[PDB]
Design a protein around this ligand. Structure first.
Ligand SMILES: Cc1ccncc1NC(=O)Cc1cncc(C#N)c1
Ligand SMILES: Cc1ccncc1NC(=O)Cc1cncc(C#N)c1
Lengths: 304, 304
């Protein structure tokens, strides 16, 4: 009973957080095995950030310039290398708290938990979605760079995001763990356009199924629709086009509730065209798109 | 930039979760030092739950009937005792992962993180408020009993809640770590009235300050009010009466933003009487009451 914006337990990730300092800049690093991963802009001063030449800036640095501290233990840096926008610092000690892990590049619309950190210390954990425009609407202040996003399948942590930047609009941008930015962003203090965003349609439908499962059913109606008709409404309201792949992933929820996907699409169509009429769904007065169908199944079945 | 419903990092609590089985009932326990804490209804069968005599049911049980398993390690039970609605199982081994901790009874309106667990395994973490009527609107399924709520001040975990029950209405009830229920609830399978709930006024005002800090300011107006006038509006909309103690706790946010508390109360008054007019505040289409003034300061300053 109940449905919350649940994050993964952050314990396995907490054991990986370290502080990385280079010159006068300090941010967060991720220590897995004998490598520490962090944003390459750790090597920049504020003046460098306007237009950095990272290859030139990294040439001035030596292994001993990167100060890595895990709690109180200082790590010895024996190698450094830049891969895209991340720095990989080889340390002489493998992290004893390294969980089973993978590096994955998530798709837009997918969700993950963020462990917000400052000076290598965890401050909070929250769940969020990678927007269709490759930005994340997080909660990050100066010092949070290097904080990571992840998903967990039983004992395996799939790291999918490392925080790098706050755009002038207050939204966030970052990379996968190979340092490739999600979206068109560059690690530079320059105004940068984030594309037109849309609402994650399959996630909204998944959340409508979670609402039915939890007893919120006032929005179910006597109507149905087609993928074509629904998609004309989705286009009008800046929703992602629904495909048969999305319908296929909604199958378990359709089967559990007995509500065909296109019937749920007709409920969503009516909510888009008429609003919520001052009513709420799972404690929200708007249509929630930060729960994937997988998240809804996991939370509604109690997967650990 | 940004403002999220952030939970505490759950790592220190994950290291305390164990599975407790007694007969055919299995639920979660909290292992701190050489004691395992769990709901006393672990000793009940489904038939006992209709009207349990816990003292009689516990008399039939011996130390060897309580199966406690931490991951794969089995703990040896050398004592058992009931304190209010919790069972305290003395084990022969102190939990090596016991963090610095306290047991605290929180006040209604205060917030905390819940680490939802099943079979002694963490599944997710979320932030919630203890409602003024002493219920929590969580996300809990069968097997989640014994999952705990907590707050963390640097290295100290203050455990404040243990989950016991889902009311017929889908809302949740539980105890402090001494087994005393929050609210009028009893650990019995009987319909039980949760009082009239109200919205946590000081938390809504705190969240309005967080909105101003993050750039959402469309709701600020040219008006002010008095505590008396505001409280007449609060009574009309089922909001908690605002006191000078609440105004006092909002002082840091008033100082940071330069918006006097009573001026923010006038903005809240106008939003209550007129609604949001299809607009949003920090990504919400309703007035959020699950952030205390302390949470807003902590999140807006990056406390670890
Ligand atoms: C103040 C703050 C808050 C949250 N997240 C991030 C920040 N600050 C920054 O973005 C600093 C920065 C500047 N220019 C480019 C990059 C990159 N890549 C990073
Ligand atoms: C099914 C479920 C889901 C979430 N939380 C809890 C439950 N189930 C229960 O409450 C089981 C129970 C029954 N009667 C009294 C108590 C107490 N105290 C507990």
């Amino acid at each position: 009973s109940g449905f919350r914006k649940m994050a993964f337990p952050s314990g396995k990730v907490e054991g990986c957080m370290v502080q990385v300092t280079c010159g006068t800049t300090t941010l967060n690093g991720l220590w897995l095995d004998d490598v520490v991963y962090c944003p390459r802009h750790v090597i920049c001063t504020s003046e460098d950030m306007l237009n950095p030449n990272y290859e030139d800036l990294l040439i001035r640095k030596s292994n001993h310039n990167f100060l890595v501290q895990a709690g109180n233990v200082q790590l010895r840096v024996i190698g450094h290398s830049m891969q895209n926008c991340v720095l990989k610092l080889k340390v002489d000690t493998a992290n004893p708290k390294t969980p089973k892990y993978k590096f994955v590049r998530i798709q837009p619309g997918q969700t993950f938990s963020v462990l917000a950190c400052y000076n290598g210390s965890p401050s909070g954990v929250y769940q969020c979605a990678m927007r269709p425009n490759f930005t994340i609407k997080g909660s990050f202040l100066n010092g949070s760079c290097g904080s990571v996003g992840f998903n967990i399948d039983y004992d395996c942590v799939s790291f999918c995001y490392m925080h790098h930047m706050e755009l002038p609009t207050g939204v966030h941008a970052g990379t996968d763990l190979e340092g490739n930015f999600y979206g068109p962003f560059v690690d530079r203090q320059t105004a940068q356009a984030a594309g037109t965003d849309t609402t994650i349609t399959v996630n909204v439908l998944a959340w409508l199924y979670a609402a039915v499962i939890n007893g919120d059913r006032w929005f179910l109606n006597r109507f149905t629709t087609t993928l074509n008709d629904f998609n004309l409404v989705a286009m009008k309201y800046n929703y992602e086009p629904l495909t048969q792949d999305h319908v296929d992933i909604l199958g378990p929820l359709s089967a559990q509730t007995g509500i065909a996907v296109l019937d749920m699409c007709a409920s969503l169509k009516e909510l888009l065209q008429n609003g919520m009429n001052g009513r709420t769904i799972l404690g929200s007065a708007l249509l929630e798109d930060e729960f994937t169908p997988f998240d809804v199944v996991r939370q509604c079945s109690g997967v650990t």
